Amino acid sequence: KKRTAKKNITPYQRGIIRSLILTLDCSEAMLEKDLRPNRHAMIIQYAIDFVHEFFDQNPISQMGIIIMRNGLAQLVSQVSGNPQDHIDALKSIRKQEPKGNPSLQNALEMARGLLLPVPAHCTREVLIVFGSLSTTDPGDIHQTIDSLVSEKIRVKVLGLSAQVAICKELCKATNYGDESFYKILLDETHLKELFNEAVTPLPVNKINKGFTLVKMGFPTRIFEDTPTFCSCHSKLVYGGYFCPNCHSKVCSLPTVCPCCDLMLILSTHLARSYHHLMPLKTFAEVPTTEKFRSEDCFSCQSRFPXXXXXXXXXXXXXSRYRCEDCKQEFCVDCDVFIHEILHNCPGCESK
Amino acid sequence: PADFVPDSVSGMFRSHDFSYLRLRPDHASRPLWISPSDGRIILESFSPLAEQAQDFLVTIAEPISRPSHIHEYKITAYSLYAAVSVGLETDDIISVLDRLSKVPVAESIINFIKGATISYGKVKLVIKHNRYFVETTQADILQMLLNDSVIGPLRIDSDHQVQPPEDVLEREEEDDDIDAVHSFEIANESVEVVKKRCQEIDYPVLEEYDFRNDHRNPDLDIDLKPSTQIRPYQEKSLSKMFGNGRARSGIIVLPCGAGKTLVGITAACTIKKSVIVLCTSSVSVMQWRQ
Amino acid sequence: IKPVFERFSSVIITSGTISPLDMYPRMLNFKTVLQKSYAMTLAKKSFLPMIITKGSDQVAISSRFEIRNDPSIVRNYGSMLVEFAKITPDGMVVFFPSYLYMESIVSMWQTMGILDEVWKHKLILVETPDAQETSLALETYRKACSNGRGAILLSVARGKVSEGIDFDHQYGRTVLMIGIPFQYTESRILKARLEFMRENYRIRENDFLSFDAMRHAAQCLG
Ligand SMILES: [Zn+2]
Ligand SMILES: [Zn+2]
Ligand SMILES: [Zn+2]
Ligand SMILES: [Zn+2]
């Protein structure tokens, strides 16, 4: 018994640069009683969590936030690499109550034009968390999906406990025919894991597009604090950064320079793309009667490995989930943890 | 004379000991813990059939406590008769109680639950031609009906008539015991004496209510419109008195000031048959009608 | 059928619904060899037949009572429809036993507020005797089924739509069957053939009527 994946068919390109723009539903159906406070409130809790997650693993990206009230979609946080803008925008919304219908044609229409400034190297994306069961379209929506799929704006949406053929279609249509993107929950954790999975880049099988060399430079912290001064906020900041080309004091941010406009990054963001781009191989669960390895773990030292013959307890499984390229054992904890936070396979690092 | 503790016998069976009363053997492996001496049945969070357990207790008894962790148990004779009239298997409830209730089923408690499930009426009031008569599915029932001044003497000699049992059911005995057994059609007059003699001789009769022997004629001038106010306890109280399929009048203890007549008007309309309304006093009849 | 049974030799009788496979050799007076049906071997459930005898009032329901109104059953029916319109995804169809059942029940369903609610949720597309309007209804049902706003198609168990029209993933999710289609609503012509069915064959009134009623009941569900 194991629930582990067979093969990854996309470690080659990930969408390392992103412009993900999440849109919500503040409609009546969010006030129904299936999710603990309701749909409306518990949805927003996990979106906050995703927001934090989305910028941690794709901090080079931006996002905007749109609500869906009264048959009218309403932008609430602009497409920004600053999560706190969105986070604070999300804090206010839950205090208002969802209302009216989801007019998807509205929401799709403003999402498509919001992403026009998003360049070729930056990736356009839309994430619809749909929870009602009817729409109200200001126009042809196939016109918009046709317009949407034309703009190279893939769409993955997370319906609630129901399947809708149009968003079956929409995720099918935009995502290069490859319908893998109307995945829907039965459950809060299933919803929770529905949110966490939307953080990483989204490759299925990339078509050959212009791979454009991207020119930027890196900022550096300021020291003088009594000289608290800023060129990105016009306030007294006790020390910021300085763009390598503009030469203007910029507060701490991976945000672009505000005087010469080159993307400001230190080092930390790209190495998340690395383990995004080239991840590891899954720790193979060693056979119970064929392992015969050290009665411990490797990344940690976990002497629990078996009990040596116990009719049922020993014939079950030997906790030796071991990576392959290193061929080193790992307790499930490490095997899970190694595969959780630091990819950085402990055995594969030391050789 | 004519007083029955069984209807109002609720309020007892909460007293146990510690020396004689042992920890229930199910107490180790039992989702509930039926304190039989204290009569309390605490339905903790560990009961998987807590919803199933909660309903069964509400029938046979009255759940005094409904706490978030565990519930509370109380004994009600009307509940015992009502749980006896509930129809749940007396043995089946006890064992799921015994297996679920960690406290072993109390000996006195076990007898009452079985006494609920079967007693609360073992009477034999037979019915003929879809009506009520002096007979019985059991033999001690036919003896009670035949030797009855109201049931027998008020009973016409005719065994049963489709119309007479339809019409007369020595009044309406739409509350009789199991019909389709040996009995004789009773007259159109006086089930007071029928009940006033089963009163004097203590005949707890396992009774029914045959709700389309609430037929009673070509259809009256009833406007079967539901425009009268409907709000949720009344309808499921109706769903209880409407039971399976068709309108049964039961006893439905309702408050004056919360739309009491509303269930009656619906059940009167639903039968589409002649109905009378009786209120306390005539002056209240107008007030209520107003 | 006797001449084609007299003429033709190798014939096959095949349907999704044939039940029983023996009523046909009886009526049609012919010889078979492999009267074989197959069960659906599935690794999953994939569908729900339910017997809604009772309503919320725990009240047995039918269209056999009349072809008429009885606010208990009607409102009970109105309650079941409106809640089904709330729950099923795009594509839902129902089958009245008779159109004159449909016409009476629906007309006074607009009398109560039951029709406005389903109009908030889905589209409602009636079956008209003129089938150009019915066709204009059905394709707009399928189009709305393949579109977003839910489409509800309501027809007659004995009507035209049940004969050849299919209900795919989206074009059909929750079929319903209000009562069982019966025909002795009308005159004694069935009685006469049924009498023949009774005299020429060893086939009773109810067994023939329930067979036909469940023959079209089976015809609609699949
Ligand atoms: Zn600044
Ligand atoms: Zn600069
Ligand atoms: Zn370890
Ligand atoms: Zn390794």
UniProtKB/Swiss-Prot annotation, chain B:
Family indicated by similarity: Belongs to the helicase family. RAD25/XPB subfamily.
Alphabetical keyword list: ATP-binding, DNA damage, DNA repair, DNA-binding, Helicase, Hydrolase, Isomerase, Nucleotide-binding, Nucleus, Phosphoprotein, Transcription, Transcription regulation
Compartment(s) where it occurs, according to its Swiss-Prot or TrEMBL record: Nucleus
Protein name: General transcription and DNA repair factor IIH helicase/translocase subunit XPB/SSL2
This protein's GO CC annotations: cytosol; nucleotide-excision repair factor 3 complex; nucleus; transcription factor TFIIH core complex; transcription factor TFIIH holo complex; transcription preinitiation complex
Summary of subunit composition and partner proteins: Component of the 7-subunit TFIIH core complex composed of XPB/SSL2, XPD/RAD3, SSL1, TFB1, TFB2, TFB4 and TFB5, which is active in NER. The core complex associates with the 3-subunit CTD-kinase module TFIIK composed of CCL1, KIN28 and TFB3 to form the 10-subunit holoenzyme (holo-TFIIH) active in transcription. An additionnal subunit, TFB6, plays a role in the dissociation of the SSL2 helicase from TFIIH after transcription initiation. Interacts directly with TFB6.
Molecular function per GO: 3'-5' DNA helicase activity; ATP binding; ATP hydrolysis activity; DNA binding; DNA helicase activity; DNA translocase activity
Effect of inactivating the gene: Essential, it cannot be deleted; epistasis studies suggest it is involved in damaged DNA excision repair.
Major location category of this protein: nucleus
Outcome (variant: K260R): Lethal in vivo. Defective in translation in vitro
Function: ATP-dependent DNA translocase. Component of the general transcription and DNA repair factor IIH (TFIIH) core complex. When complexed to CDK-activating kinase (CAK), involved in RNA transcription by RNA polymerase II. May have 3'-5' helicase activity alone, the TFIIH core however has no 3'-5' helicase activity. Also involved in transcription-coupled nucleotide excision repair (NER) of damaged DNA. In NER, TFIIH acts by opening DNA around the lesion to allow the excision of the damaged oligonucleotide and its replacement by a new DNA fragment.
Any further remark recorded for this protein: Present with 825 molecules/cell in log phase SD medium.
GO biological process annotation, one example: transcriptional start site selection at RNA polymerase II promoter
Residues annotated for ATP binding in this entry: L254, P255, C256, G257, A258, G259, K260, T261
Domain of life: Eukaryota
